[PDB]
Amino acid sequence: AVFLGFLGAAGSTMGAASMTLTVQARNLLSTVWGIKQLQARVLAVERYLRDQQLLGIWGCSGKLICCTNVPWNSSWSNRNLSEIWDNMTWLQWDKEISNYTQIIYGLLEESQNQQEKNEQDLLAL
Amino acid sequence: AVFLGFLGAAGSTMGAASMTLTVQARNLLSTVWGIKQLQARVLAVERYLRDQQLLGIWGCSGKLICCTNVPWNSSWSNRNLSEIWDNMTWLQWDKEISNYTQIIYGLLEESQNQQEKNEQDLLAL
Amino acid sequence: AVFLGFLGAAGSTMGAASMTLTVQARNLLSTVWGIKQLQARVLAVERYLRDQQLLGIWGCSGKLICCTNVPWNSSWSNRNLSEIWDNMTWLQWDKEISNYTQIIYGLLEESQNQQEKNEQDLLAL
Amino acid sequence: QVQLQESGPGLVKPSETLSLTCAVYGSSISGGYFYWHWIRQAPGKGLEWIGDVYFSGTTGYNPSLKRRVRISADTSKNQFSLNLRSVTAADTAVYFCARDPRGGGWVPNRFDVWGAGVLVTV
Amino acid sequence: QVQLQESGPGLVKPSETLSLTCAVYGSSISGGYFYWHWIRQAPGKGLEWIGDVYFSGTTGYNPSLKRRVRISADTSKNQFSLNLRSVTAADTAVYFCARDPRGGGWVPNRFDVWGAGVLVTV
Amino acid sequence: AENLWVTVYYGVPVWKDAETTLFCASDHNVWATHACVPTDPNPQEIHLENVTEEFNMWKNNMVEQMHTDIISLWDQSLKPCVKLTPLCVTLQCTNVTNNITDDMRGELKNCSFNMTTELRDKKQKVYSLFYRLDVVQIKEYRLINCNTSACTQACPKVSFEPIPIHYCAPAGFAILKCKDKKFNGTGPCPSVSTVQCTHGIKPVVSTQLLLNGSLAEEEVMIRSENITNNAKNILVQFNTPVQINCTRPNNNTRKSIRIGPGQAFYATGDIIGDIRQAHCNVSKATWNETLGKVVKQLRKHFGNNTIIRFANSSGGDLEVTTHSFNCGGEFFYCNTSGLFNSTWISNSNDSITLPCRIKQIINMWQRIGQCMYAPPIQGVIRCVSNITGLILTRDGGSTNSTTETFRPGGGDMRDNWRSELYKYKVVKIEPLGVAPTRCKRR
Amino acid sequence: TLQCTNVTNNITDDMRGELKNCSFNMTTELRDKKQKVYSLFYRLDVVQ
Amino acid sequence: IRSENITNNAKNILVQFNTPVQINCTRPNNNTRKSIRIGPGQAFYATG
Ligand SMILES: *[C@@H]1O[C@H](CO)[C@@H](O[C@@H]2O[C@H](CO)[C@@H](O[C@@H]3O[C@H](CO)[C@@H](O)[C@H](O[C@H]4O[C@H](CO)[C@@H](O)[C@H](O)[C@@H]4O)[C@@H]3O)[C@H](O)[C@H]2NC(C)=O)[C@H](O)[C@H]1NC(C)=O
Ligand SMILES: *[C@@H]1O[C@H](CO)[C@@H](O[C@@H]2O[C@H](CO)[C@@H](O)[C@H](O)[C@H]2NC(C)=O)[C@H](O)[C@H]1NC(C)=O
Ligand SMILES: *[C@@H]1O[C@H](CO)[C@@H](O[C@@H]2O[C@H](CO)[C@@H](O)[C@H](O)[C@H]2NC(C)=O)[C@H](O)[C@H]1NC(C)=O
Ligand SMILES: *[C@@H]1O[C@H](CO)[C@@H](O)[C@H](O)[C@H]1NC(C)=O
Ligand SMILES: *[C@@H]1O[C@H](CO)[C@@H](O)[C@H](O)[C@H]1NC(C)=O
Ligand SMILES: *[C@@H]1O[C@H](CO)[C@@H](O)[C@H](O)[C@H]1NC(C)=O
Ligand SMILES: *[C@@H]1O[C@H](CO)[C@@H](O)[C@H](O)[C@H]1NC(C)=O
Ligand SMILES: *[C@@H]1O[C@H](CO)[C@@H](O)[C@H](O)[C@H]1NC(C)=O
Ligand SMILES: *[C@@H]1O[C@H](CO)[C@@H](O)[C@H](O)[C@H]1NC(C)=O
Ligand SMILES: *[C@@H]1O[C@H](CO)[C@@H](O)[C@H](O)[C@H]1NC(C)=O
Ligand SMILES: *[C@@H]1O[C@H](CO)[C@@H](O)[C@H](O)[C@H]1NC(C)=O
Ligand SMILES: *[C@@H]1O[C@H](CO)[C@@H](O)[C@H](O)[C@H]1NC(C)=O
Ligand SMILES: *[C@@H]1O[C@H](CO)[C@@H](O)[C@H](O)[C@H]1NC(C)=O
Ligand SMILES: *[C@@H]1O[C@H](CO)[C@@H](O)[C@H](O)[C@H]1NC(C)=O
Ligand SMILES: *[C@@H]1O[C@H](CO)[C@@H](O)[C@H](O)[C@H]1NC(C)=O
Ligand SMILES: *[C@@H]1O[C@H](CO)[C@@H](O)[C@H](O)[C@H]1NC(C)=O
Ligand SMILES: *[C@@H]1O[C@H](CO)[C@@H](O)[C@H](O)[C@H]1NC(C)=O
Ligand SMILES: *[C@@H]1O[C@H](CO)[C@@H](O)[C@H](O)[C@H]1NC(C)=O
Ligand SMILES: *[C@@H]1O[C@H](CO)[C@@H](O)[C@H](O)[C@H]1NC(C)=O
Ligand SMILES: *[C@@H]1O[C@H](CO)[C@@H](O)[C@H](O)[C@H]1NC(C)=O
Ligand SMILES: *[C@@H]1O[C@H](CO)[C@@H](O)[C@H](O)[C@H]1NC(C)=O
């Protein structure tokens, strides 16, 4: 079934947990009582579609691991790679970087737009 | 915070308005009164999904500015680049070619299909 | 005017029917009576979104003819290309490999995941 | 039951466009299975292919008449029209419209069902 | 009815960051149609451009003051702020905030509506 | 030197606490299985390791959601049933005279009254037996519910037997279990396990003597929102059954009276046999050992040397003063005083027999304006239930003095559901994530 | 049916041909019983 | 002044003021409400 091994790597480190993104990814979609299940299904569909729209706006459409080209400001986190991928878990990382998430989202959006414009004017020639 | 400048560039020229496409894309998705809200949400989801399918059929999936390889027939509009991107707005342009839209969509669809077939034939070799 | 030949190439061979995928692909989206109609719409939307998610997980997002790098094990089928694309129809093919479908989907999923990981490792350098 | 009927002017002044319309009650033109040909037969002569049209618009005409002919096919009302430009005195013939199961390549080009056959004298 | 109002300290010790917030009642900063400039005029002198800010944060300052100034526009409350660091005696001036219809290629830099104008002595 | 760049990951295993609407998963009755989804035959449980999750049974939205669901289900199930508006008439009643029992005196009354029939222009005269709790003096009596609201009869076909209802979660959400033994509801749980759907949560309704449910696995457990404060209730979960046998030894007869065009009123007719009070039997040794385990567990949290006293119900409404429950459609209000009458201090075959009172006019929830009329059940009723918990409240004002008094309490039905919905928590996944990594698109 | 009479206590000239003291029998909590009750109904509400 | 067709008199005319005209209505009578039971639970409120 699609529920097999759901989450699972919650306690795993970020590096180890990054190898099982498909399992979590494929589980995000699937008289008054009818309006309950129906509304829940519509809500899940809306959330998934919004998340997919955000990914497409960032240019990572149809990709699970798609790393962008915007620089990482050291203010968000001064930790080095060895101390995050092999020493921290995803839940702790999310709890750490929560205040700077929207700024990074905006930076990704503007970077993708600028890249699209650059490609457009390059292809114009 | 997501609304934050919906439309805005309606009065701008086409070229300038093309630089703020992202702001107009994030807001396209988000007893009987629950039915009212649910039907509104489902209609919005259906419209967004139809638009996304139409974009994907042309090969422009996950792109806000994606330009294809089909030619611009002069019969659709004789206006030149200097007078369309710097002298006319998007509403006027849409009203001008409102009755020449379906054939363009069909040409884009068949061109994308031919491109995919040619890619398959080339890669088979 | 979107129906326009739905399932037109049902009796056609696989090779001939593969040239009209867009016709069949564009029709997947479009008090208690309103509830039933809205539930049907939501079911169609959910099926289409699960389909799109399954296609995207394999890296074939935004492509109608996407061919991957997973080898074709002869155990699933022993018929050659000449007896498949020119001698068989899509319904017969689906009935023939109806019991070797899940393993193919799984193989495609892990192949795409491995491809993404290898691309990330190569691009890190 | 599937059958085609041809309509248009049975007598036209030479030296301008001649328009014929073949409408099929039966297999739909939109279906990507059949090609719709426009075989012609002049008196005292054999058959002569003019052109064919597919549901997706990939038409192909005879090399002899590649310039003087235009075949269109509209699926909303399920018919297809032939426009022969600059018809001469040698165009007096019976203009058949035929069906070919070339699409769905089980078999090669094979005209199986034919229209009634309208005789145009110019 | 569109206008702009400036606020901030009218007197500051001339070695620190100088903050001046211009808020617009009328048009919205979020809309990508107007640039928001910070023209200055010292007594007995002409106008002097300082910098401008767009809705997307692509700001540009005067080359003379490219190091001592920073313009930050917040669209949640629809205002913008000028932070002029290392202020000296040359900054005794009236700090106007202007609107430019450069957003949209209809016209070039065309400052049309100007703020009240606050004299920030220092 | 670092040259590290932002990277976005999809399907990340990150969750946040959230509240949503759970739905059915079952496998005619008041707990309608028709509008409830079928359950899979192979439930999947994904054990999560090295995860500590903060649970709080007292802030669970799922219990309130279940309470509203149960109330709505009962209201829906009562809709297609006859309304007993004509029943509000003056009843001419007399005492029951045949085969009287000393305990069963001042009880069920032979009442007679005029009521409508199939034809509007007629009035039949009918007799029936009505319990004392149902009627009230206006030699004239009226139904207790007449001056509150007209309320509907319960259809005989639908059964009130609890049925398990597995509460699954929508797509994108998850249900986290807590298998960690010796868990007091609140605080961190280190043994977290995702479950597609919950276990059997049989919707049994009762007070102070929580019937069929999930027993503890290690020993008796005591849970309370703030044990220092005496206002909050204290849930006690047993680790062994205390099986109870409650019965009505009165062979009853049901007679159908036609009150309208197709509407039928089911009344208690003959009481052939001997009249005897319904009784609840609890084993003596089993209750003694279970209460001793309870005593030890309470003494753990209330000092090693203290006097604890188990007294009977304080007072209030009959629902919030006796052990109410349903076994076969007849609602036994078994009075619990012998069970909670003892004192414990630092240091064969007989079984107790509680008194029970049958009632037909029922206001199960804390609502005024709606009732039911339980039809009489032919024959004898025996349900042989499982006592597997209690709700006890501490009497405040004892100060630092060693005296402590725990007495039965409750009234609110959320506590009944909270005992079987404590290990479960609802979370929503956040598949999007951002991290550093050596990358550049192009 | 209502048995009504004109008001007579502290009546003003403008408020004449107006709210009427009506009395009538009505059902009660017990089906087999009736009660005589009264109310002051405005003229626009009632009609002969 | 706004109207769909001011030339045609059939259509209504909406006049929107620029300042409000303060207007105060009142019913000086000190009425009383009495509840009488017309059935089980249902109660009718009457003028006293
Ligand atoms: C707690 O757990 C106990 C564990 O048994 C549970 O006892 C069960 O009570 C139900 C109450 O309905 C019993 O079900 C009845 O069983 C008898 C004997 O089998 C049947 O004759 C009954 O039939 C009724 O329904 C029929 C239609 O289907 C009618 O035609 C008939 O006239 C009856 O009305 C009914 O099915 C059940 O048997 C017991 N369990 C056992 C093992 O006997 C108890 O209910 C649980 N809850 C509480 C609050 O105690
Ligand atoms: C209709 O379909 C049948 C098969 O479903 C076609 O029969 C095939 O004909 C070709 C001739 O070249 C043979 O090579 C195949 O082996 C035949 N199929 C089978 C299963 O034996 C038939 O030609 C089709 N007819 C039309 C008009 O399309
Ligand atoms: C407002 O929009 C109008 C047109 O919608 C603009 O008019 C154009 O002005 C430019 C520059 O003066 C001319 O080159 C064009 O020919 C004009 N077009 C039309 C249709 O009038 C006008 O400039 C805009 N004004 C502002 C302030 O943006
Ligand atoms: C990572 O953390 C600090 C520098 O950020 C340093 O002490 C440590 O050695 C680093 N790790 C490695 C493997 O160098
Ligand atoms: C449009 O621009 C082209 C550029 O060379 C020019 O040739 C043409 O005359 C222009 N047409 C109009 C209508 O301005
Ligand atoms: C299509 O729209 C253009 C826009 O002006 C108009 O000139 C033309 O006549 C229209 N054609 C038809 C067939 O409506
Ligand atoms: C029924 O018995 C009770 C016992 O207290 C008594 O008060 C009552 O009067 C009796 N009924 C009649 C009708 O006398
Ligand atoms: C109740 O009274 C009726 C007469 O109204 C009588 O026929 C019936 O036997 C009595 N039943 C009991 C149990 O007293
Ligand atoms: C039923 O009707 C009879 C008719 O005489 C009457 O005597 C009796 O009191 C009525 N029953 C009541 C009011 O309960
Ligand atoms: C209904 O009547 C009973 C019996 O007299 C009484 O105890 C109760 O308070 C009454 N209810 C109301 C709302 O007056
Ligand atoms: C009551 O507990 C006993 C103890 O094992 C068990 O066998 C029985 O099934 C339980 N009955 C219920 C929960 O109805
Ligand atoms: C529950 O246990 C936690 C530690 O696991 C403790 O902090 C808390 O005080 C306990 N609460 C009660 C009511 O026992
Ligand atoms: C429990 O009640 C006491 C009363 O003194 C209070 O101080 C304490 O904060 C309460 N517990 C919690 C967790 O708030
Ligand atoms: C109860 O009465 C019925 C009526 O005939 C009888 O069939 C049944 O056996 C009685 N119950 C017992 C336990 O004897
Ligand atoms: C309950 O106990 C009493 C007295 O011990 C006994 O007479 C009766 O039969 C018992 N009933 C059940 C159901 O155990
Ligand atoms: C309840 O009854 C059953 C069977 O009649 C019996 O086995 C059990 O011991 C009884 N419960 C007691 C005596 O607590
Ligand atoms: C049982 O509770 C009631 C009400 O709280 C009380 O009056 C009575 O005294 C209690 N029983 C005993 C034996 O004290
Ligand atoms: C329960 O029974 C005991 C013992 O007879 C009695 O003292 C108590 O009052 C009863 N409960 C109530 C609420 O009356
Ligand atoms: C009440 O006064 C009106 C107005 O004078 C009169 O027409 C009407 O007859 C009066 N009502 C009665 C019952 O006389
Ligand atoms: C109310 O009933 C009495 C009893 O007969 C009757 O006299 C009176 O007229 C009735 N009231 C009406 C008809 O308004
Ligand atoms: C308004 O009404 C007049 C009536 O004579 C009519 O002539 C005129 O056309 C109407 N206005 C419009 C815009 O049609």
CA distances from C106 to A13, C53, F42 (A): 25, 14, 21
Evaluated on CA atoms H9, H11, H12, H14, the torsion sign reads negative
Secondary structure (DSSP) of D26-38: SS-SSSTT-EEE-
H33 in contact with F at a CB cutoff of 8 Å?
A: no
How far is the C-alpha of C113 from the C-alpha of E38, rounded, in Å? Answer: 52
F35 in contact with C at a CB cutoff of 8 Å?
A: no
Task: Specify which residues F177 forms β-bridges with.
Answer: F193
Distance between Cα E103 and ligand 3 center (Å): 13
Three-state DSSP class for residue C15: helix
End-to-end CA distance of chain A: 51
CA distances from B101 to B93, B95, B104, D54, E86 (A): 12, 11, 5, 22, 58
Q: Which amino acid is at F324?
A: S
**Where is B119: in which H helix or E strand?**
helix B102-124
Following CA atoms F49, F54, F60, F66 in sequence, which dihedral angle do they give, to the nearest 10 degrees?
A: 10
Query: Candidates F95, F110, F131, F137: which one to mutate for ligand 7, based on the most atoms within 8 Å of Cβ?
Result: F95
How far is the C-alpha of F436 from the C-alpha of F433, rounded, in Å? Answer: 11
Distance between Cα F180 and ligand 12 center (Å): 14
Ligand 9 residue neighbourhood (C-beta within 6 Å): F 90, 92, 113-114; G 32
Distance between Cα F257 and ligand 7 center (Å): 26
Query: Shortest Cα distance from E57 to chain B (angstroms)?
Result: 13
Please identify which residue in the block is written with the tokens 């009442």: F111
Please identify which residue in the block is written with the tokens 């809500």: A43
The minimum-distance atom of ligand 12 relative to the CA of F225 is 13
Q: Which of B4, B12, B23 sits opposite E104 (nearest CB)?
A: B12
Closest CA to B25 of C41, A59, A123: A59
Q: Neighbouring chains of E at 3+ CB pairs within 8 Å? A: B
Closest CA to B91 of B2, B10, B16: B10
Experimental method: cryo-EM
For residue D102, the chain C residue with the least C-alpha distance is C16
Question: Do chains G and F touch, with touching meaning 3 or more CB–CB pairs less than 8 Å apart?
Answer: yes
**Range 50-89 of A in CB contact (< 8 A) with F:** 51, 54-55, 58-60, 63-72, 74, 77, 80-81, 84-85
- Cβ atoms within 10 A of the Cβ of E45, count? 10
- Nearest-ligand number for the alpha carbon of F161: 1
Is F225's C-beta closer than 6 angstroms to any atom of ligand 12?
no
Cβ–Cβ below 8 Å for B9 and E33:
yes
Q: Helix axis angle, A32-57 relative to A101-124, nearest 10°?
A: 60
- Token pair belonging to E32: 């990508």
DSSP summary character for residue B27: G
Which contacts qualify for B49-57: CB closer than 8 Å, 24 or more apart?
A: B49/A49, B49/C29, B49/C45, B49/C48, B49/C49, B50/C29, B50/C30, B53/C25, B53/C26, B53/C28, B53/C29, B54/B105, B56/C62, B57/B109, B57/B112, B57/C22, B57/C25, B57/C26, B57/C64
G31 in contact with F at a CB cutoff of 8 Å?
A: yes
- Token pair belonging to G3: 């048995």
How far is the C-alpha of C6 from the C-alpha of C20, rounded, in Å? Answer: 10
Q: Side-chain half-sphere of A95: how many Cα atoms within 13 Å?
A: 8
The angstrom resolution of this structure is 3.5
How far is the C-alpha of C116 from the C-alpha of C113, rounded, in Å? Answer: 5
The minimum-distance atom of ligand 2 relative to the CA of D110 is 27
Closest CA to B111 of B77, B78, B71, B83: B71
Contacts of B34 (CB under 8 A, 6+ apart): A35, A39
How far is the C-alpha of B36 from the C-alpha of B30, rounded, in Å? Answer: 16
Q: Side-chain half-sphere of D117: how many Cα atoms within 13 Å?
A: 11
Is F72's C-beta closer than 6 angstroms to any atom of ligand 10?
no
So where are chain A's domains? 7-123
Query: Shortest Cα distance from B29 to chain A (angstroms)?
Result: 7
Nearest residue by C-alpha to atom 3 in ligand 20:
G25
A contacts of B26 (beta carbons < 8 Å): 53, 57
Is F434's C-beta closer than 6 angstroms to any atom of ligand 10?
no
Q: Which amino acid is at G12?
A: T
Q: Which amino acid is at F147?
A: N
B contacts of A42 (beta carbons < 8 Å): 38, 41-42, 45
Cβ–Cβ below 8 Å for F440 and C120:
no
**C-beta of residue A77 within 8 angstroms of C-beta of residue A93:** no
- Cβ atoms within 10 A of the Cβ of C40, count? 10
Nearest residue by C-alpha to atom 5 in ligand 20:
G25
Closest CA to E93 of E61, E46, E35: E46
Q: Which of B38, B62, B117 sits opposite C62 (nearest CB)?
A: B62
C contacts of A34 (beta carbons < 8 Å): 35, 39
Distance of CA F362 to the CA centre of its chain: 14
Nearest residue by C-alpha to atom 11 in ligand 11:
F386
Closest CA to B55 of B21, B85, B86, B80: B21
Closest CA to F421 of F214, F226, F216, F236: F214
- Nearest-ligand number for the alpha carbon of F186: 12
How far is the C-alpha of B48 from the C-alpha of B27, rounded, in Å? Answer: 11
Q: Side-chain half-sphere of D62: how many Cα atoms within 13 Å?
A: 14
Query: Shortest Cα distance from A121 to chain C (angstroms)?
Result: 24
Query: Shortest Cα distance from F441 to chain C (angstroms)?
Result: 8
Ligand 15 residue neighbourhood (C-beta within 6 Å): F 245, 247, 279, 281, 351, 353
How far is the C-alpha of D28 from the C-alpha of F123, rounded, in Å? Answer: 73
Cβ–Cβ below 8 Å for G27 and H38:
yes
The minimum-distance atom of ligand 14 relative to the CA of F380 is 13
In three-state form (DSSP H/G/I as H, E/B as E, the rest C), the secondary structure along F213-253 is CCCCCCCCEEEECCCCCCCCCEEEECCCCCCEEEECCCCEC
G25 in contact with H at a CB cutoff of 8 Å?
A: no
Cβ–Cβ below 8 Å for F114 and G29:
no
Backbone dihedral region of F234: left (phi > 0), alpha (psi from -120 to 50 degrees) or beta?
beta
Closest CA to C82 of C18, C8, C13: C13
Backbone angles phi, psi at F95, to 5 degrees: -70, 150
**C-beta of residue F24 within 8 angstroms of C-beta of residue F432:** no
Distance of CA D6 to the CA centre of its chain: 9
Contacts of F20 (CB under 8 A, 6+ apart): A40, A43, F169, F170, F173, F426, F428
End-to-end CA distance of chain F: 19
Is F56's C-beta closer than 6 angstroms to any atom of ligand 13?
no
**C-beta of residue B29 within 8 angstroms of C-beta of residue C45:** no
Residues of C with CB under 8 A from a CB of B: 19, 21-22, 25-26, 28-31, 34-35, 38, 41-42, 45, 48-49, 61-65, 67
C contacts of B45 (beta carbons < 8 Å): 45
Q: Which of G27, G37, G38 sits opposite H39 (nearest CB)?
A: G27
**C-beta of residue F326 within 8 angstroms of C-beta of residue F381:** no
